[PDB]
Amino acid sequence: GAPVKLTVSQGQPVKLNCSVEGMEEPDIQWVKDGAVVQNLDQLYIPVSEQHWIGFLSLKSVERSDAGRYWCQVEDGGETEISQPVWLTVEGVPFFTVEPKDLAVPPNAPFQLSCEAVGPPEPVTIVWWRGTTKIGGPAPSPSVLNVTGVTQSTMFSCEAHNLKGLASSRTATVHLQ
Ligand SMILES: [Zn+2]
Numbered sequence: 047g048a049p050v051k052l053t054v055s056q057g058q059p060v061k062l063n064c065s066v067e068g069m070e071e072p073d074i075q076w077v078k079d080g081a082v083v084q085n086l087d088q089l090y091i092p093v094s095e096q097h098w099i100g101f102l103s104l105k106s107v108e109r110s111d112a113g114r115y116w117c118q119v120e121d122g123g124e125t126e127i128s129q130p131v132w133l134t135v136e137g138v139p140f141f142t143v144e145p146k147d148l149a150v151p152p153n154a155p156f157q158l159s160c161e162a163v164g165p166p167e168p169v170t171i172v173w174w175r176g177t178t179k180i181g182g183p184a185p186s187p188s189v190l191n192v193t194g195v196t197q198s199t200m201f202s203c204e205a206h207n208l209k210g211l212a213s214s215r216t217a218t219v220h221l222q
Pocket of ligand 1: 206
């Protein structure tokens, strides 16, 4: 278990490679997190007799493309296979917890919350109410305690990491 670790920025193409050795006509397949890969360009070429390289192309990486990839061959036996590559996709923060819309009575207290993650880490959050910075910058997860509102009000989180900024959905708190 010595995986290679490949880090790519969101939206960039990437190509992964594996080596398969010790077998004439291996049936090679790319696997991601233990599942046979679908809907990606796969290429398997011979450099010598008994020496093959597998090639997996991704056109424009998103978060869901991150995972552990490797090549497997059926039967295999003494076939030597390259170690897995761990694909990590870096970019601006992603909100795992969005702020929720609420209906509240006037001057009644409430709490909103949001969570955002990288990579890269760490992530900090600021809260906006209308166009006014309230809370933060503070780490994730973030909560916002509000004493009350007297009219419909918008709240959103803005998350920050090395790669830049992401906004949450805008929550609306309306009067019941
Ligand atoms: Zn910064």
